Design an enzyme around this catalytic site. Structure first.
Site, PDB file in Angstrom:
ATOM      1  N   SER A 175      16.744 -11.399   4.856  1.00 39.33           N
ATOM      2  CA  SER A 175      16.348 -10.471   3.816  1.00 39.33           C
ATOM      3  C   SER A 175      17.250 -10.571   2.584  1.00 39.33           C
ATOM      4  O   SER A 175      16.757 -10.835   1.482  1.00 39.33           O
ATOM      5  CB  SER A 175      16.322  -9.058   4.365  1.00 39.33           C
ATOM      6  N   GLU A 201       8.741   2.557  -5.303  1.00 37.53           N
ATOM      7  CA  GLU A 201       9.120   3.913  -5.721  1.00 37.53           C
ATOM      8  C   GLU A 201       8.841   4.921  -4.608  1.00 37.53           C
ATOM      9  O   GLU A 201       8.009   4.645  -3.734  1.00 37.53           O
ATOM     10  CB  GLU A 201       8.353   4.307  -6.985  1.00 37.53           C
ATOM     11  N   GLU A 228       6.537  -5.976   2.255  1.00 35.39           N
ATOM     12  CA  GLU A 228       5.803  -6.984   1.447  1.00 35.39           C
ATOM     13  C   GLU A 228       4.338  -7.201   1.875  1.00 35.39           C
ATOM     14  O   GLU A 228       3.898  -8.339   2.104  1.00 35.39           O
ATOM     15  CB  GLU A 228       6.561  -8.326   1.271  1.00 35.39           C
ATOM     16  N   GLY A 229       3.608  -6.083   1.976  1.00 39.13           N
ATOM     17  CA  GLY A 229       2.204  -6.073   2.397  1.00 39.13           C
ATOM     18  C   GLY A 229       2.080  -5.959   3.906  1.00 39.13           C
ATOM     19  O   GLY A 229       2.615  -6.804   4.652  1.00 39.13           O
TER      20      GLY A 229
END
Lengths: 381, 381, 387, 378
Positions: free
Chosen positions: C95, C137, C366-367
């Protein structure tokens, strides 16, 4: 220490009242005795022996919840379930034939018909003298009824109507325009001018039962043939909801057969010195079959008792129909994959039957969405 | 006319006696009140918390099935389950602590003990004054009892013993050779007794909110008055485990419900594309599966609980329910985990605690698939 | 020819010599420097910021960044290979690395001015400067972080959440909406540590990725000079290009974690006995081992081929959805499979439990699994099903 | 770059120019000649031995057999692409072809005498001669069908079960014990004591004609025993080659199901829109796409490894098991989506149910692979 019945772990037998157990016993005796010897040839060549309606009638298996007054055997919902479970144990096709008379024909006439309609139609449907079909599905419903002197003139087509090519009595749903345009139910009879019922051949599943169309071309229907006590979605849907309940129980009978046919097979067959039943993996599958059947039966039974007591909402039927059909299919596929040939291949029949069943009366997925809306207050279609 | 309860489709609440509802609600009030505020701290730091035993003893939740004669609350099996479900609804670790007391300590004492043993130990265990534990894991056991003057001397280690580092009473199962036969016998011991050590295990991946350890037996002297007289062999620890697995099968469903309710609220609260997450078909299917599996699983443990209260329940049924409950709970926990975003700070990440708890529970003993595979086929794998 | 159970398709032979050498260097570093750290780091949620310099030195930060700007100038296949070796140890370390490469270096290179490129990239390459990426956010079209024109540049107010590296970052690439000329569009802004109105508090008590420090970015009318705005991108294209880059390395990395759980599982069953028999000889155990091998083996063919297609510029963005969804999904199944195979409760083997909670976050970041299914469904059908 | 939903990894671009030609050759034949037959052929369990003629004509039989013996002299990737395109239409057709290629021609070429090779290979290649393969016996390595030495030289007795092509075979490759070891024997249509009667009423593979071989002290001239193989290596070599072809073919069947399911959801409406607008539907479509896409990379690499000489036998286990399992799942997914052409899926489905279970119901390939990892037999 208690006996363990692997074939009935929770002793469903002892959860039943005696008349219920004896209705079950009668249906069992009948299906194994009269349908089992028919099933292989009938499915192979796609043959329906309509004498089957007449047979189930003689012993009181048609419209089980219909009162003795109107020729029915006046049984409860648990009994309707047990009957369906016993008939489908042999073939889903024969369960459908019976599902259509009981839930899709006798039920609407009883619930929504006048006293004359009930007195004219229900006695003969109860015996199987008269065979019913149910015309809802079409090729937002298009089929129309126009008021005429004496009654109504109907026009439109229904498609995929089980029992229709051999039906005496048709329960047909059409839109009638007051200025409000609503769904109504009409009773029609074999011989009515403007009414056609072409047969349908070539099915992959449910091949033991016969299906067709209902074609309408200004078919006159008299005033005494409109269901007076229903308008809109309520009519057709009450019928579907009744049927789904029997289908919930039926699929579980199919699942038990597959389970037993798989279980015997592995007891019987050998690989590398041991019977297949010695295998660890094989035992997990059998444990899965048994578990899911066992829980499914508590599910449908409890639903039966609630329906009998009037505390069952309609979304419970989504749970059980979805569960029974989905689990039954899983069990049929597990059983199929356990077999190495290309006789005990009744399993292949049950499998293609259940592939169709899981697609009708609402898909697995649409029932999920019914439960999703009831949980979230949001429609996802 | 009948309303749908998405949170109890089959109205289990109405399938209970008001008695059992009050037992359920009492345990609910306790767990939500007393245990829930502790759990995140207790889990994250694997803290040693013992005041839970008095707390549950005061309100009569320890050894539910033990008669009032010996300080028990004299309740039935259905009520046991309801308590276990309510504690596990908060945390499996707490349910575990309580499972040892009731099923693996009070139960063998009550069933296999002498009168004197029963009045010495049970009333203090019942109030939580004394914390019990159960020494089984290490038929082919290595821990041994030797005949000596005035009693027995015991040697061996017991591993993964929950409550052990804080117990006042130890129910240890050891092999005793006598006369020629080498059978399995049960022994009671007390805290701070010579040759007995109970060191802790730290750094657990799950069940962190519960203190676990070892029992260490270095030629530990046990009087004649401390050997359980009324059982030799398998039936001793088996009885206790059977009782425990009954409780566990009920408890895992509680944890499953927490994950479900949490996942449901989360998808209602969280928005994506201007739309709650609950609007998505994929989300709703998951919510339907959770609801279905819990609802059926709860009918399963209800029936079994009623069957045990009537002595109609074979031991194999317990394997069905314990396997199903734990299995389905874990899937549901995984379903719920996979439905969340972010990582560790919200209440909803209680799902992650439940998840790792259930990973332990699901593999603690596929012992039950095999028990059932053999019960169906007669053959052992 | 003989069988390699650990590399059935001999991927080792499908590589170029340079790519292979790049892999061995990443292996040597991860095993030598990262493996001895990971157990306490994860247990105590500690990140040794010195890891970034170690990574920089040996060319593991921005693997595909040109040598002009300090990068080692490598191909996509080598980038993937690097991510696999780091994630073999821990996803938290992969990561750290994929953020620096795809979410910081990439957008500055691809979208930044010559001035920004030369100012920022070399120090991100050596690891002297640590980067972080401000998009998420407390999807990007519903963003509320707002940049507003002022004399000399822009003023930025808003909040970003779950930002890996932020508490120790020198460089912040922050995505924020700017109403300009006609349109309210998404712009990228570069921020430096120390800047007034900028704070990055750490987040503590993570369930997964505990080996990598993560925090917030809180902008309170933080001043950004005209020279700090990425001039060459507007709208979703900005954030998306970075994410597409990140998903590529994540899809390789996850097969590394999968391989570890597979290897650990296999060694375990070689050692443990049950009913007098080695656990290895059980049939069901062998089925699980065969499933793990199969999925890894095929998953590797997929990401390598994706790697090739990207290097030759024939790869569409949708192929990244396939491989990110597959690697993460299959790796998670494999981690779960391994965990269910062990008894006990918390040792070396419960390194699997670490890999597991890591992969549970990765599958979710990430989705989601489902979002990538819906990208694929839309591409197959032409009908969008997101809302 | 443009996305290809139907070939996301651009497999076209990974194939040599002549490999893409052979695929299209097989595609053209399958869609042109086989697809118009298959519904009726399957439904009434009729087979048309003309298929052998038509495939032989265009060199689709024994594709890896050298031109020296009448085969097209192609590589393993090409064989795979051929299997895939035939099975794309039907598993039964692929089966007949795979027996011809892998179970008859391969053992003759590999274990036969130059004379056996010269006699049989060319006529098998053109499909003038139809072959079959006799290993599996009614209840059963340790077989019971036996050869004993008579005067020049062999007398075979025993039975072989579930033998595809047998009732129409010109050439028969039988495996029997002789001392004590397994050996292969070539018999031809007409040999006294040899019978090949048909098996009717199959659930799946109904488009391939299947039968048994009954050997009642059937005499085999000494010139007919395969000289160059003894024991397990003989039948296994054939099965390993066939498994490779099945691994490609299963994906072809999977592709049709995926493509049929896709079009159906595009064409059919519910609640005012196409089925394809459903999230639940798109996820199924994405899974089908993924597993096929990956499965193809796997069999392509295995192919290249075979052609290189760098592949052990265990890799074929990974791919056959994966391809069959995944194809079956995809076929079931596709079935469960349908509410007719679309019901080509139900035919592919019953085919794949047979194909997946053909080598026993105890997952022999998992064990082969587990063994290969641990070093410990199951």
């Amino acid at each position: 220490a208690a006996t363990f019945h692997w074939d009935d772990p929770l002793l469903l037998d002892q959860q039943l009242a005696d008349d219920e157990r004896m209705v079950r016993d009668a249906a069992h005796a009948y299906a194994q005795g009269k349908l089992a010897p028919r099933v292989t040839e009938a499915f192979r060549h796609e043959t329906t022996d309509a004498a089957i309606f007449r047979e189930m009638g003689e012993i009181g298996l048609l419209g089980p919840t219909i009162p003795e007054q109107y020729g029915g055997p006046g049984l409860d919902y648990v009994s309707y379930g047990l009957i369906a479970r016993e008939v489908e144990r042999v073939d889903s096709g024969y369960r459908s034939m019976m599902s259509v008379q009981s839930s899709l024909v006798m039920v609407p006439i009883f619930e929504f018909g006048s006293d004359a309609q009930k007195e004219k139609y229900l006695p003969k449907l109860a015996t199987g003298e008269w065979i019913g079909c149910f015309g809802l599905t079409e090729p937002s419903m298009v089929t129309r009824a126009r008021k005429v002197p004496g009654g109504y003139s109907l026009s439109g087509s229904k498609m995929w109507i089980t029992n229709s090519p051999i039906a005496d009595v048709f329960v047909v749903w059409a839109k009638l325009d007051d200025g409000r345009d609503e769904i109504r139910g009409f009773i029609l009879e074999k011989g009515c001018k403007g009414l056609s019922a072409p047969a349908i051949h070539g099915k992959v599943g449910l091949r033991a039962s016969i299906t067709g169309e209902i074609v309408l071309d200004e078919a006159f229907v008299p005033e005494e043939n409109i269901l007076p006590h229903v308008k809109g979605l309520r009519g057709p849907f009450t019928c579907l909801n009744s049927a789904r309940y029997g289908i919930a129980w039926g699929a579980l009978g199919a699942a038990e057969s597959c389970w037993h046919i798989a279980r015997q097979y592995v007891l019987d067959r050998k690989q590398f010195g041991r019977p297949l039943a010695a295998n660890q993996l094989i035992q997990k599958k059998l444990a899965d079959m048994q578990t899911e059947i066992t829980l499914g039966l508590q599910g449908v039974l409890r639903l039966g008792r609630m329906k009998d007591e009037g505390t069952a909402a309609v979304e419970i039927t989504s749970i059980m129909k979805r569960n029974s059909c989905g689990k039954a299919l899983d069990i049929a596929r597990l059983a199929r994959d356990m077999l190495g040939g290309n006789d005990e291949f009744g399993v292949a029949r049950h499998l293609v039957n259940l592939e169709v069943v899981n697609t009708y009366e609402g898909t697995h997925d649409i029932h999920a969405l019914i439960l999703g809306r009831a949980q979230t207050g949001i429609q996802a279609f």
